[PDB]
Every structure is written in C-alpha cells, then in structure tokens.
Enzyme design. Structure first.
Site, PDB file in Angstrom:
ATOM      1  N   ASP A  55      51.642  42.303  36.007  1.00  0.00           N
ATOM      2  CA  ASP A  55      53.513  42.248  36.120  1.00  0.00           C
ATOM      3  C   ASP A  55      53.543  40.914  36.348  1.00  0.00           C
ATOM      4  O   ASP A  55      52.538  39.959  36.711  1.00  0.00           O
ATOM      5  CB  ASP A  55      53.916  42.677  37.706  1.00  0.00           C
ATOM      6  CG  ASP A  55      53.473  44.307  37.607  1.00  0.00           C
ATOM      7  OD1 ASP A  55      52.910  44.786  36.822  1.00  0.00           O
ATOM      8  OD2 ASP A  55      54.011  45.312  38.246  1.00  0.00           O
ATOM      9  N   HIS A  57      57.721  40.159  36.748  1.00  0.00           N
ATOM     10  CA  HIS A  57      57.952  39.024  37.663  1.00  0.00           C
ATOM     11  C   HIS A  57      59.310  38.495  37.578  1.00  0.00           C
ATOM     12  O   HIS A  57      59.616  37.558  38.297  1.00  0.00           O
ATOM     13  CB  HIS A  57      57.966  40.317  38.787  1.00  0.00           C
ATOM     14  CG  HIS A  57      57.690  41.464  39.108  1.00  0.00           C
ATOM     15  ND1 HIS A  57      58.637  42.084  39.211  1.00  0.00           N
ATOM     16  CD2 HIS A  57      56.549  41.908  39.584  1.00  0.00           C
ATOM     17  CE1 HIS A  57      58.119  43.579  39.967  1.00  0.00           C
ATOM     18  NE2 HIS A  57      56.773  43.321  39.655  1.00  0.00           N
ATOM     19  N   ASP A  83      56.823  44.867  34.758  1.00  0.00           N
ATOM     20  CA  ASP A  83      57.387  44.776  35.835  1.00  0.00           C
ATOM     21  C   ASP A  83      58.006  43.474  35.243  1.00  0.00           C
ATOM     22  O   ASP A  83      57.329  42.712  35.834  1.00  0.00           O
ATOM     23  CB  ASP A  83      56.669  45.088  36.700  1.00  0.00           C
ATOM     24  CG  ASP A  83      56.875  46.248  37.245  1.00  0.00           C
ATOM     25  OD1 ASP A  83      57.928  47.609  36.853  1.00  0.00           O
ATOM     26  OD2 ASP A  83      56.837  46.540  37.780  1.00  0.00           O
ATOM     27  N   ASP A  86      62.209  41.460  37.196  1.00  0.00           N
ATOM     28  CA  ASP A  86      62.969  41.976  38.213  1.00  0.00           C
ATOM     29  C   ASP A  86      62.123  40.631  39.438  1.00  0.00           C
ATOM     30  O   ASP A  86      61.203  39.883  38.944  1.00  0.00           O
ATOM     31  CB  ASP A  86      62.790  42.679  39.333  1.00  0.00           C
ATOM     32  CG  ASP A  86      64.143  43.540  38.639  1.00  0.00           C
ATOM     33  OD1 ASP A  86      65.066  43.035  38.125  1.00  0.00           O
ATOM     34  OD2 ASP A  86      64.301  44.807  39.621  1.00  0.00           O
ATOM     35  N   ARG A  87      63.156  40.410  40.618  1.00  0.00           N
ATOM     36  CA  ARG A  87      62.176  39.506  42.143  1.00  0.00           C
ATOM     37  C   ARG A  87      61.667  38.237  41.020  1.00  0.00           C
ATOM     38  O   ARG A  87      60.692  37.927  41.410  1.00  0.00           O
ATOM     39  CB  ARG A  87      59.872  40.196  42.213  1.00  0.00           C
ATOM     40  CG  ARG A  87      60.372  41.739  42.896  1.00  0.00           C
ATOM     41  CD  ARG A  87      62.073  42.339  43.848  1.00  0.00           C
ATOM     42  NE  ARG A  87      61.203  42.433  44.917  1.00  0.00           N
ATOM     43  CZ  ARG A  87      61.200  42.906  45.128  1.00  0.00           C
ATOM     44  NH1 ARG A  87      60.223  44.854  44.302  1.00  0.00           N
ATOM     45  NH2 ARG A  87      60.038  42.986  46.576  1.00  0.00           N
ATOM     46  N   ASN A 115      57.456  50.235  36.099  1.00  0.00           N
ATOM     47  CA  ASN A 115      58.486  50.906  36.579  1.00  0.00           C
ATOM     48  C   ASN A 115      60.285  49.642  36.772  1.00  0.00           C
ATOM     49  O   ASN A 115      61.529  51.237  36.986  1.00  0.00           O
ATOM     50  CB  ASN A 115      58.103  51.552  38.025  1.00  0.00           C
ATOM     51  CG  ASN A 115      57.896  50.478  39.276  1.00  0.00           C
ATOM     52  OD1 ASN A 115      57.533  49.613  38.375  1.00  0.00           O
ATOM     53  ND2 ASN A 115      57.909  50.539  39.967  1.00  0.00           N
ATOM     54  N   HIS A 116      59.948  48.884  37.149  1.00  0.00           N
ATOM     55  CA  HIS A 116      60.889  48.135  37.254  1.00  0.00           C
ATOM     56  C   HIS A 116      61.446  48.168  36.057  1.00  0.00           C
ATOM     57  O   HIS A 116      63.146  47.743  35.852  1.00  0.00           O
ATOM     58  CB  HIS A 116      60.756  46.659  37.443  1.00  0.00           C
ATOM     59  CG  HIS A 116      60.345  46.734  38.917  1.00  0.00           C
ATOM     60  ND1 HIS A 116      61.046  46.192  40.137  1.00  0.00           N
ATOM     61  CD2 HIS A 116      58.851  46.554  40.266  1.00  0.00           C
ATOM     62  CE1 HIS A 116      60.920  45.852  41.512  1.00  0.00           C
ATOM     63  NE2 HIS A 116      59.741  46.436  40.832  1.00  0.00           N
ATOM     64  N   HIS A 165      51.153  50.760  32.917  1.00  0.00           N
ATOM     65  CA  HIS A 165      50.773  50.473  34.163  1.00  0.00           C
ATOM     66  C   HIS A 165      51.334  50.192  35.731  1.00  0.00           C
ATOM     67  O   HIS A 165      50.595  49.986  36.105  1.00  0.00           O
ATOM     68  CB  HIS A 165      52.977  49.288  33.766  1.00  0.00           C
ATOM     69  CG  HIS A 165      53.406  49.153  35.213  1.00  0.00           C
ATOM     70  ND1 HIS A 165      54.157  50.471  35.828  1.00  0.00           N
ATOM     71  CD2 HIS A 165      53.794  48.230  36.289  1.00  0.00           C
ATOM     72  CE1 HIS A 165      54.660  49.422  37.001  1.00  0.00           C
ATOM     73  NE2 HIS A 165      54.089  48.501  36.865  1.00  0.00           N
ATOM     74  N   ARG A 212      55.642  54.901  48.418  1.00  0.00           N
ATOM     75  CA  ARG A 212      56.617  54.640  47.237  1.00  0.00           C
ATOM     76  C   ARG A 212      57.757  56.266  47.390  1.00  0.00           C
ATOM     77  O   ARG A 212      57.124  57.467  47.188  1.00  0.00           O
ATOM     78  CB  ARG A 212      56.314  54.107  45.755  1.00  0.00           C
ATOM     79  CG  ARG A 212      55.113  53.036  45.892  1.00  0.00           C
ATOM     80  CD  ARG A 212      54.704  52.478  44.264  1.00  0.00           C
ATOM     81  NE  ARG A 212      53.930  51.746  44.754  1.00  0.00           N
ATOM     82  CZ  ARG A 212      53.964  50.045  44.728  1.00  0.00           C
ATOM     83  NH1 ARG A 212      55.550  49.825  44.670  1.00  0.00           N
ATOM     84  NH2 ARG A 212      53.310  49.406  45.108  1.00  0.00           N
ATOM     85  N   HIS A 239      50.936  48.550  38.800  1.00  0.00           N
ATOM     86  CA  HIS A 239      52.282  48.928  39.284  1.00  0.00           C
ATOM     87  C   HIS A 239      51.674  47.955  41.282  1.00  0.00           C
ATOM     88  O   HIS A 239      52.572  47.362  41.882  1.00  0.00           O
ATOM     89  CB  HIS A 239      52.052  50.011  39.512  1.00  0.00           C
ATOM     90  CG  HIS A 239      53.584  49.994  40.138  1.00  0.00           C
ATOM     91  ND1 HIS A 239      53.644  51.994  40.928  1.00  0.00           N
ATOM     92  CD2 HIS A 239      54.961  49.710  40.347  1.00  0.00           C
ATOM     93  CE1 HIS A 239      54.618  52.460  42.096  1.00  0.00           C
ATOM     94  NE2 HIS A 239      55.433  50.695  41.689  1.00  0.00           N
TER      95      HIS A 239
HETATM   96 MN   LIG Z   1      55.360  45.709  40.155  1.00  0.00          MN
HETATM   97 MN   LIG Z   2      55.792  48.874  39.302  1.00  0.00          MN
END
Ligand SMILES: [Mn+2]
Ligand SMILES: [Mn+2]
Lengths: 301, 577, 366
Positions: A55, A57, A83, A86-87, A115-116, A165, A212, A239
């Site tokens: 990731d 991000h 991913d 995001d963030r 997932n993001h 991921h 989660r 992940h």
């Molecule tokens: Mn992530």
């Molecule tokens: Mn993830």
C-alpha cells in the site's frame, strides 16, 4: 501512433513534480487505461523479474522515495498491490501517476485492486474531498472509481508467488475460483471478492470474524492448505499495516508488505518492498519517508 | 456583453463570481464616466455578498485606478474598498488593505490629506475589531505624503490603536509597527514610537510580545547606535528572558539580523550573553533556532574579538549541544557547524572541531550525518587534504557502507572531490574498492550516484586510467544474474562513453553492449536499446552501420513491445534506418 | 492550625522538573504528592477552616503550579494531519497537576468559600491565564479547566462579562488567525451552560455574540472536534429566542461547506437539530433557502451526506412543518429528488430516495 505515447511521457514527467493534470487529461487517461485493464484476467501472469510494492495510500513523496530505492518505473518491473487513494494529502497525483505508468508501460507495471479502491471507502476518507478540492467537482472522482472497477483482484508471479492486497477467503478454495469471480463491480460488502481484499492472517488456527467490518481471518493451517492445493510457495499481501514494513507469518507461507512509510503521517512505520529476480530469490528492501519541508475557506466555490 | 451588469444581480453564486471576474471587461465597455457615476456606487450599495465574491471583487477593484479616468478620480474607489476592509473574514480583509495601500500611491497629496486620511480615521474608529485591524495596515503608506498636522493626527490614531484593549487589534498594530516606524521621522520615533514598542513588548499576551520583538529589528535599524542602549536595549533584554518560549524563539530566529542591525559593540556586551542563555534554553525549539543561527552570529562577529569570543563563550556551548538529547537540535547544529571551521582556522579546527565532527559522524541520527557530510568541503579547504585523510578518511569509509541510503548518497556525491585531492594512485589503492562496490548496491539512487561518480572520476583522471582500472570491472559486472546489475553496467557504459573517447568506446564498450542485446530479460534488452541510442553518436558511422544496425534490427523484432518501441526510437534518432 | 496549612502550601509551591528526568527528586515528588493529597483530605473533611488570609496563598499556589507557557504542539500541524487523529500527548507532572486541579475544584466548591472576598484575589489576570491554559492537549486537563471555569463563572458574577469577552477573543483568534486550538469543546460546553443560564430578554450583546462568534466558528476545518458542543449552544440559543432562528440558518447556509463532506453531514445534523425547535412562523422565513440547499445536498454523489439529507424524511415534525408549506416547498425538492431517483451507485440511497418520493407524494398530491 506515438504522439499519444509522447503526450503520456510529458504527463508522467509533469506528475513527477507533484503537479496534477486537468479534468480532461485525467478523463482521457482513465478511458485509455480502462481499455487495457479490461483485457487483463482476474489473476495475471507475471514475469520472473518483478518488484512487488504494498500500500502507498497516496503518500506521493514517499512514492518518489520508493521509486528511488527500486528503480525507474520503465527500467524496473513493478507490481502494486493496492490502497493508493486514501489517507494521503497527495492521493490524486499518486493514483493518476500510477495509472499513467500502467497505460504507458503495461508490461513493466501492473496495479492491483485494494479494499480502499471502492466508492464507499474512498468517500468516507479524504479522496473524494481531495478530488473536490483539486478540481471543484466529482467528475475526476467518478472517472477514477470507474477505472478502479476494472482493476484485477490478484496476480501470480511465475506460478510460485501469489500477489493479492487482502487475504485468502473461505468461499475461495483454489485459484481457478478467483478467475471465476466477476471483478467489474464495486467491492461487494460481503462475498468472495470482499474477503479476497479484506482478509488478514492470524494465529487463531481457523476462519474467524475479522476485527475489521468485513472479511474473515485465516489460520496458519488454512494458508498451508491453500498453498499445497494450489502448488503456491508464498502468498504476498499488503492489507494489514506492519510496523516493520515486511512481516513473515504462518511459517513463512504468507508475507505482509507495507510500502507506505509514516502511514497517515503519524504511524512512523518504516516501509518495505519485495524484489524477485530471475531465480525468484526474494529480497526485501526497506526505506524511510522522503524528507519534507491561511487556507482557502471550505465554502469557497 | 451588456447583460453582465444584470448578471451581477443574479442570485447564482458561480455566475456572480464569473461576472465579478468579467468586471474589468464590463467597466472597460462602460467607460470611465459611466463606471464612476453608476457602477462604482452600485457596488457600495450591494457590497453584502458571499465572502468569495467579496474577495474576488476586492482583487478586481485593484486595477481600476486607470479605469476610473486616472488619479484625478481615484477617490471614487475609496468607498467600495472601505466596505471590503470591514468584512469579518481575514483573506478578503488582506486583499482590501492591499488594494487601499496600492491606491494610496495614486492619490495626490491633497487627496490623501482630504480623503484617504479621514477614511483610515473612520476605519480606526470602527466599532468592530475588523475595521481597526484593516486600518492598522494603512498608516505607513499614506503618512509621508501628508502634512504635519495630518501626520500628528495619524500618529495619535496609531497610538490609540496600539493602546486598544482588543488583543487582535494590538496584534495587528505590533505587526505593522515596524512598517509604520520606517516612514516616520527619527525625532518622532524617539518620542512616540518607542513608548508604543515598549508597551507592546510588555503586553499580557505573548502573541503580541513576539510581534513586538519581530519589529524590534526594524526599530533598531531606524535609530542611530547611541540610542539603542537607552531606548531599545532594556526592552530587548527583558524580552530575551521572557517566560513564553515563543518570545525566546522569535529572538533566536531573527538573531542574525538583530546583531547585524545593532553592530559589533552592542553584540559583545548585550547579546553574546543572551545567545549563551538562548543556546541552553529549556525549550528544544529555542535551542534548535539558536544552533541554526550560530554560524551567522559567528560570521558577523567583530574581527578583533571573533576568535576569542567563539573560543570562550560559544565553543563550549557548541560542544554541549553536540551531544544534545533532542535530535532536531543536533541536526540543526550539524547543518552549520562546518561554517565555523573557515572562521576559526586550520589549527583551531583540528584542535576543537575535528573531535566534534568525529562524534557527529558516528551519531545515530541520519539527519546529523547527512548535514555533517554535505559541508565537509569547507574543512577540506581549511585543513588540507592531508589532515582530512589522516582524520576523516576512516569515517568516510565507514559511512560509505552505512545503513541509511541517503547518507551513502551524500558521501558518494562528495567522493569525487576526495578522489581529486588524494590523487589517482591513492584512490586506486584505498577508495576504488568502495566505488566499485557502490555499483552493486540494492538502492537504485545509490547506483545512479555511483554511475555519475564514475563519469566524474574518468573525466578527472583521463581515459587511459579509466580503461586500465574501471572499464574491466564494469564490463565483468555484466555476468551478474540479477538484471538490476546489468542495468547498472549499461548505465555505467552510457556515462563513460562520453569521456572514454571514440576509440576506447568502440574497442571495448560496444562488444559488451552487443552481447547484452541477446540477454533473455526484456528489461535489459530495451535498456541495451537505450544504451545504443545514447552512445550512438560517439561511434563512427562505419562501425555503427557495420555492427549496431543489424543488432537494433534484431531488437526491433523482439516480442516485447517496449523493446520494439525503443529499438525504433534508437534507429530513427541515429538515422541508421 | 492554619500555620501548617500555609507552610504546606508554600511547600507544594515548589515546581519539579518531571519532564527532564522522572527519577530526579523522586522522593521529593512523592512527598509533595502525599502532602497535596493530605491538604485535599483536610479541606474535604474539615469545615469552617477556610480563613481569609489563605485565599492569596491558594490562588498564588495554583498560579505558580499551573499557569505556565504550554509546550510546542506535539502533534504536527497541517492539512496532512487529521485533527481527529491527533494523539493526545499527556503531561509528565500529571500526578501533581491533577491533584492541584482537584484541590482547586474542592476550594471553589467548598460551602465556606465566598465570592465577595476572593473576587479581589482572583482578578482579570487570573481569568486570562486560566483561559490561555485551555490550549493544552491533555483531555483530562481540559476537563478540569472546564469545571473550574464553570465554577468561577457561577461564583464570581462580576467577572462574567470579562470571562465571556476573553472567550470571544480566543475564539476570534481561532477563527480568523490560527485555525489551531484544542480547548474549543470545553469552552463551548461552558457557553452551552451560560446560554442555559441566560435571561429571557436577550441583550444585544448576546445576539451579536451568537451571530459573530458561534456562527463563524463553523467555518473552521476543526469543527468535527467539537461540533456537538457548538450544535447544543446554537440550539439552546434558539430555544431562548425564536426570532433569531432566521439569521442563524441564513448564516449556516452562507457558511455551508462545499469541499468538505464530513462537515456537510454535520451542518445537516445541526440543521435537523435546529428544525426540531423551529416555530411554524419562524419556519416560513427560511422554508425556501433551507430546502434549496437541502435539495442540492440530496443530489450530492457523497452517500453519507445524501444519507443524512434523506434521514430528514423520518422526522414526523418536519413533515408537519412542510405540510402547511408544501406549496412553496415541493417545486424545489421535486426536480432534484426525481433526477437522483433515476439511479445511485449506492443501493441504500436509492431505496431511501424511493421512500422519500413515496412519502412526499402521499402526504400531498399535486
Ligand atoms: Mn491499506
Ligand atoms: Mn486494505
């Protein structure tokens, strides 16, 4: 025609200086990338020399730091698990640069869904707000999510390494099943694709409700059974955040790689990447974040 | 076209903003007379709008000085501008104050004394703090072009604004105090500005004290040297020991400009002690700022006492800060410690700084090592190559293989200077191993820096030594099974082709590159295509057509589309076809 | 007697540097902590022992032990860092500061304490330092500051105008200058209490306070940190007077976020909270402007904003309000809702839109 290739080179050069493109430019880029992404199978064959990255991000400066360690994107084969939206305070530039690299050099780089990479997760986090701030509308956001709908779920490096991921799923039993799943849809809230991107490895020895919101947690025995059935020797995932940046779990049957150093700018985790040569001898390169150096009102529109 | 004047009244926010953007064009169409008679008053009556429309309008009204028939009628913009200054939001207030400052220059002195000064008197007397905050930034521009009585009135208004009970107004007044005192005559500065500065420096809120300290440098600059010890020095000494860490940080940040403005005599008696106290401050940020400003203070010291003042009053504090617990202080000190080597001299450097350098070289903080290596050329010039090799070279070779890649990058980028100073024989004997091992480093950036270092060394030591020593090792690195090292060999060949000359390149570099063309990996194949495109012009046309043409032709038939494209690009740019 | 109380007060007046070394003076720290606790046990149990001469001693002890220049912001400041994700950095000498806070709280809340005497010893300077101290990151310290400020406001009637005024300048500085503060939530809780303590004929000072302080407070990006407190204060102010519902709503509509989706959800939550108190006559003034913005928010691709917007349809009181105003309300809600009704990437939002359309058609048919 090479004129579009030269335009893509110019776009990549511009993006290397954290300068986002225009709405029309990103729209055309996503439209071009969708054509090549829809031709890719759910599990993608990968050549032996490849560097797998976890990731990012949207930490763009750390992405340039990553490119320094591994190498130039055309020169060194790269594989991004997911991913990357995001963030991050530079998510738009990061994702559009990754997509530009993917369209310009399809063989030298492959991007995998995370997932993001879904409308719900992207919206509850800053990517939608980032797109609104940097473009004043949701057109670029819509184009990016439509492209993310076409991303592959998993990749396979020379049949011996499995790159996904998230994690292994109870419904999924063999790679043939993953090929069957229909990935041209937003992450199903519950289902095989959901678990494929939301699962985590753990030491509870069995499928168990993930902490989660969605997915399950796979025990060492499940991972070993999956490798033995599929003939896989190693499964790579990204992940779970790992403070080390690289993590060996389940008797070295699974590896978690996080390539986003100083995650959320607060974690201070040292990131790491995986490199596979012709003999597929895996080696991990760890790196730290790149050195770093009145706002407009939120109702200004 | 003419519809935009009605569009100004349209409810839509975005269309209103667009019509405000087109205000320049509309007003150009209207003409000066009708714009001043009708459009300008219309804006004042309808000023109330979304903050974004307000800010855009204030920006647009700036270039209206000519669109209003020139400075003769520039006063027509003063009523609309004033309303924008009242707006609560800060960003529009700043644009309004900037526009008024720009317009003030256009007005005739009689216009300033008759129109502009009453406007700022009204702004300063506004009930809401915003009016007073906007007015605080207008006394400087309009003061010099007014009359004596008007000047006294403007001074009284500024004194009233400074003595305001509103903290934010006091903050604005302290911010603009230096700018106001610049235009003010020195005799008035002595009698009126100094009491205001003293009052602001003793304010209840530190947010005003720091701004007072910030303006103190301009105040000291304006006054003559003899007045400082009696008017400002006590005020600054009180501020150097202020409880808030923020005041001490502001003192540290502007310490260089301050001592320069105070000159040498004030520094040796009222500031060296303050810097000593500031260096050992409880707050880490103050210590970091003081350590950052240490080189500049040491560089602007009087020549007669510089060496002594650094030895006795500064050097022990530098030694103490070298082993400071906080990492930021050490990193800041390491960035400017090399600057004091030139000042102190060779013998004083090897006697005092070298131990500190060695200590900072072995420090675990990556930033400290990076900062120390970057400015080592100063020490190299100060003490010569011999003492550096006797003392620094073990540290250099130790850091050559440090865990952090950026430190290795810094030392490798600095290596060619050492190679030139020590001579080719010394580099071959002791440093060649490190340079050759830098090529197989896992970090690509280190490999690129090593390639550039190789280019720099063979251009410094000539082609012959390059072919004798470096060429073989690189041309043998090709056999490495990892393709990354094959990329490194190709990059090294590309860099060395320019310097090695046509003969050496055609003799040894070309056969290796042609052999690599047949490599199984596509990444090396198109990299070979890139290398042949780069080193193409150097080789003569005969060898090109004889050898590289059917090789680029074979590569153009490769399965990889990247290899195809790069082979086509190489065959096209070199016109080999 | 009181002499040993005074001597212990001077003893605990000595500050200790916990930050530089925890081990340094460990016995001296434990002795001070035990003495503080003993003084707490003494004031809590003993009665009619709080004499006049000890007031300057206790206020000066609190000033010396507590009033100080806060440390630099531990958490980084910038757009990269979410204020909600700020790690709460503690204070090293908390085992002492917490006891000082408890002792001060017990002293102000003691029945023997009289405001008329301490109002001389506690002046505007003490209140100013106390308000300055609100910027500390430690949530427990902020809570103790909140409760001591509430006690000081309830006891000293003379300083109430000054205490309200100083809150305004901190809030103004926060809105217009720095946009960085941590004490807002506690300050808003104190105001929520003060507003509840207001009189029915609201003074013009309070009217401009609400319009020019609490309303612009929304424009800052850190609203999430303290939004429920601001919502309560605005709703409490509207509970006191119905006439200024129009300006509050018009100022909220003016400051409606366009680049932040979380802040769009909160303004709506706040608007729903306001609508539960709105009068039928006061609703007539803002029925069109509020619903134009809500229709825009319904069409928003962001699911969370659209969710909260459509959540309005579950409020029966709002239906009762728009029933008598449907004539001027349906023509503006109908177009956007019908357009969004075609499709939405989120199935739940599609279902909510269908439910809203069905309810809107059944409640009145045109
Ligand atoms: Mn992530
Ligand atoms: Mn993830």
């Amino acid at each position: 025609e090479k004129v579009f290739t030269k335009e893509l080179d110019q776009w990549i050069e511009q993006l290397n200086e954290c300068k986002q493109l225009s709405e029309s430019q990103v729209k055309s880029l996503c439209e071009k990338a969708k054509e090549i992404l829809t031709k890719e199978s759910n599990v993608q064959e990968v050549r032996c020399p490849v560097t797998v990255c976890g990731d990012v991000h949207g930490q763009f400066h750390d992405l340039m730091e990553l490119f320094r360690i591994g190498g130039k994107s055309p020169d060194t084969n790269y594989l991004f698990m997911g991913d990357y939206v995001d963030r991050g305070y530079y998510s738009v530039e990061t994702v559009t640069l990754l997509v530009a690299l993917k369209v310009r050099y399809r063989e030298r780089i492959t991007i995998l869904r995370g997932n993001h990479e879904s409308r719900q997760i992207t919206q509850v986090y800053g990517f939608y707000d980032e797109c609104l701030r940097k473009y004043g509308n949701a057109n670029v956001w819509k184009y990016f999510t439509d492209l993310f709908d076409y991303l592959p779920l998993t990749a396979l490096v020379d049949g011996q390494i499995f790159c996904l991921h998230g994690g292994l799923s109870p419904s999924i039993d063999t790679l043939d099943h993953i090929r069957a799943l229909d990935r041209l849809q937003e992450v199903p809230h519950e289902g095989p694709m959901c678990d494929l991107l939301w699962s985590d490895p753990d030491d509870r020895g069995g499928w168990g409700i993930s902490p989660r919101g969605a997915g399950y947690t796979f025990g060492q025995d499940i991972s070993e059974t999956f490798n033995h059935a599929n003939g896989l020797t190693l499964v790579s995932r990204a992940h779970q955040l790992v403070m080390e940046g690289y993590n060996w779990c389940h008797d070295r049957n699974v590896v978690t790689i996080f390539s986003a150093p100083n995650y959320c700018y607060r974690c201070g985790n040292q990131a790491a990447i995986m490199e596979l040569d012709d003999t597929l001898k895996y080696s991990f390169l760890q790196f730290d974040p790149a050195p770093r150096r009145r706002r407009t009102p939120d109702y200004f529109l | 076209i003419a519809v935009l004047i009605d569009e100004l009244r349209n409810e839509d926010v975005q269309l209103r903003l667009n019509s405000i953007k087109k205000l320049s064009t509309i007003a150009l169409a209207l003409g000066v007379e009708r714009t001043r008679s009708e459009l300008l008053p219309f804006l004042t009556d309808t000023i109330y709008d979304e903050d974004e429309v307000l800010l855009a309008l204030a920006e647009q009204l700036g270039n209206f000085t000519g669109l209003v028939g020139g400075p003769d009628f520039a006063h027509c913009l003063l009523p609309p501008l004033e309303n924008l200054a009242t707006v609560e939001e800060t960003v529009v207030r700043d644009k309004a104050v900037e526009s008024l400052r720009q317009i003030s220059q256009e007005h005739t002195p009689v216009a300033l004394e008759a129109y502009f000064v009453p406007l700022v008197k009204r702004l300063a007397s506004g009930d809401w703090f915003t009016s007073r905050t906007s007015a605080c930034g207008l006394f400087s521009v309009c003061y010099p072009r007014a009359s004596n009585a008007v000047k006294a009135e403007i001074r009284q208004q500024f004194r009233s604004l400074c003595s305001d009970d509103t903290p934010m107004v006091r903050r604005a007044a302290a911010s603009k105090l230096g700018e106001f005192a610049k235009v003010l005559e020195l005799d008035s500065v002595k009698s009126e500005i100094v009491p205001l500065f003293t009052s602001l420096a003793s304010d209840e809120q530190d947010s005003v004290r720091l701004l007072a300290v910030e303006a103190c440098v301009s105040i000291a600059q304006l006054l003559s040297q003899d007045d400082l010890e009696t008017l400002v020095m006590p005020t600054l000494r009180q501020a150097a020991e202020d409880k808030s860490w923020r005041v001490r940080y502001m003192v540290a940040d502007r310490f260089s400009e301050l001592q320069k403005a105070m000159g040498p005599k004030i520094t040796l008696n009222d500031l060296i002690p303050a810097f000593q106290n500031l260096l050992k401050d409880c707050e880490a940020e103050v210590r970091a700022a003081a350590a950052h400003k240490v080189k500049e203070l040491g560089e602007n010291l009087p020549i007669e006492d510089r060496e002594t003042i650094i030895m006795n009053q500064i050097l022990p504090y530098i030694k103490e800060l070298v082993s400071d617990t906080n990492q930021h202080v050490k990193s800041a000190l390491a960035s400017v410690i090399m600057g004091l080597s030139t000042i102190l001299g060779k013998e004083n450097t090897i006697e005092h700084l070298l131990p500190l350098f060695l200590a900072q070289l072995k420090d675990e903080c990556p930033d400290v090592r990076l900062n120390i290596i970057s400015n080592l050329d100063c020490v190299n010039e100060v003490i010569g190559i011999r003492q550096l090799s006797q003392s620094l070279l073990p540290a250099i070779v130790e850091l050559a293989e440090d865990a952090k890649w950026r430190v290795r990058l810094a030392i490798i980028e600095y290596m060619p200077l050492l190679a030139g100073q020590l001579g080719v024989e010394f580099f071959d004997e002791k440093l060649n191993s490190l340079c050759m091992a830098w090529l197989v480093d896992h970090v690509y950036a280190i490999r690129e820096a090593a390639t550039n270092n190789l280019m720099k060394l063979v251009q410094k030591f000539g082609t012959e030594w390059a072919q004798n020593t470096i060429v073989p090792k690189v041309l043998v690195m090709a056999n490495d099974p990892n393709y990354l090292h094959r990329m490194t060999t190709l990059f090294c060949i590309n860099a060395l082709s320019e310097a090695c000359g046509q003969e050496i390149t055609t003799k040894q570099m070309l056969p290796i590159v042609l052999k690599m063309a047949g490599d199984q990996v596509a990444n090396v194949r198109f990299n070979v295509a890139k290398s042949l495109q780069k080193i193409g012009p150097i080789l003569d046309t005969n060898a090109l057509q004889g050898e590289v043409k059917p090789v680029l032709q074979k590569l153009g038939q490769d399965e990889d589309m990247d290899v195809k494209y790069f082979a086509q690009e190489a065959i096209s740019v070199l016109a080999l076809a | 007697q009181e002499k040993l109380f005074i001597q212990k007060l001077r003893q605990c007046c000595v500050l200790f540097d916990f930050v530089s070394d925890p081990l340094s003076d460990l016995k001296w720290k434990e002795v001070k902590r035990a003495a503080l606790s003993e003084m707490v046990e003494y004031i809590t149990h003993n009665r009619n022992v709080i004499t006049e001469p000890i007031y300057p001693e206790v206020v000066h002890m609190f000033a010396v032990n507590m009033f100080r220049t806060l440390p630099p912001s531990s958490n980084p400041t910038g757009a990269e860092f979410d204020p909600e994700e700020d790690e709460p950095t503690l204070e090293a000498a908390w085992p002492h500061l917490q006891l000082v806070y408890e002792f001060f709280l017990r002293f102000l809340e003691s029945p023997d304490f009289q405001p008329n005497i301490a109002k001389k010893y506690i002046d505007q300077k003490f209140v100013l330092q106390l308000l300055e101290l609100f910027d500390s990151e430690d949530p427990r310290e902020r809570d103790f500051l909140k409760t001591t400020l509430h006690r000081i406001y309830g006891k000293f009637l003379g300083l109430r105008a000054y205490i309200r005024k100083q809150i305004n300048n901190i809030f103004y500085r926060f809105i217009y200058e720095t946009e960085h503060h941590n004490g807002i939530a506690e300050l808003l809780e104190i105001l929520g209490s003060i507003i509840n303590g207001f009189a029915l004929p609201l003074k013009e000072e309070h009217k401009i306070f609400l319009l020019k302080v609490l309303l612009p407070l929304h424009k800052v990006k850190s609203l999430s940190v303290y939004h429920p407190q601001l919502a309560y204060c605005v709703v409490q102010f509207l509970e006191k007077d119905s006439t200024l519902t129009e300006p509050v709503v018009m100022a909220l509509l003016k400051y409606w976020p366009k680049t932040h989706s979380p802040k769009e959800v909160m303004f709506l939550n706040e608007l729903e909270e306001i609508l539960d108190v709105i009068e039928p006559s006061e609703f007539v003034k803002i029925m069109e402007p509020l619903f134009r913005q809500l229709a825009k928010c319904v069409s928003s691709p962001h699911f969370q904003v659209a969710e909260r917007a459509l959540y309005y349809w579950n409020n029966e009181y709002i239906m009762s309000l728009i029933s008598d105003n449907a004539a001027k309300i349906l023509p503006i809600m109908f177009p956007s809702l019908y357009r969004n009704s075609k499709t939405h990437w989120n199935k739940t939002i599609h279902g909510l839109i269908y439910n809203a359309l069905k309810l809107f058609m059944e409640m009145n048919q045109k």
